[PDB]
């Protein structure tokens, strides 16, 4: 049920809080920009859902504290996402929607 997440943990670590979450089919995740900017949110397209309507873009960007992008999904299963410029540093995660 209706989630939110903060990109850039309160400790200044390049991770989104929560970096793993559980909502059910049709609920959302309304993530915001909070630390060691910039930040990004791109999903992997794990099944048949339009991750391309639940992610920023492999070029979208959150550079100022408080910026945001929102995502809403309904294909029962779990889908992966990450931050392009921080992928290799650990700014990667997995959402669940059922």
Swiss-Prot record:
Record-level GO cellular component terms: plasma membrane-derived thylakoid membrane
Entry keyword Metal-binding: yes
Species annotation: Synechocystis sp. (strain ATCC 27184 / PCC 6803 / Kazusa)
Name recorded for this polypeptide: Plastocyanin
Keywords of this entry: Copper, Electron transport, Membrane, Metal-binding, Signal, Thylakoid, Transport
Residues holding Cu cation: 39, 83, 86, 91
Domain Plastocyanin-like per the UniProt entry, residue ranges: 1-98
Membrane topology note: Peripheral membrane protein
Parent-protein start and end of this portion: 29 to 126 of 126
Cofactor: Cu(2+)
Lineage: superkingdom: Bacteria
Membership in a protein family: Belongs to the plastocyanin family.
């Amino acid at each position: 049920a209706n989630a939110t997440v903060k990109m850039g943990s309160d400790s200044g670590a390049l991770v989104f809080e929560p970096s793993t979450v559980t909502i059910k089919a049709g609920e959302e995740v309304k993530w915001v920009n909070n630390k060691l900017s910039p930040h990004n949110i791109v999903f992997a397209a794990d099944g048949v859902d339009a991750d391309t309507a639940a992610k920023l873009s492999h070029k979208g960007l959150a550079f100022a504290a408080g910026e945001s992008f929102t995502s809403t999904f309904t294909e029962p299963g779990t889908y992966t996402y990450y931050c392009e410029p921080h992928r290799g540093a650990g700014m990667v995660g997995k959402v669940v929607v059922e």
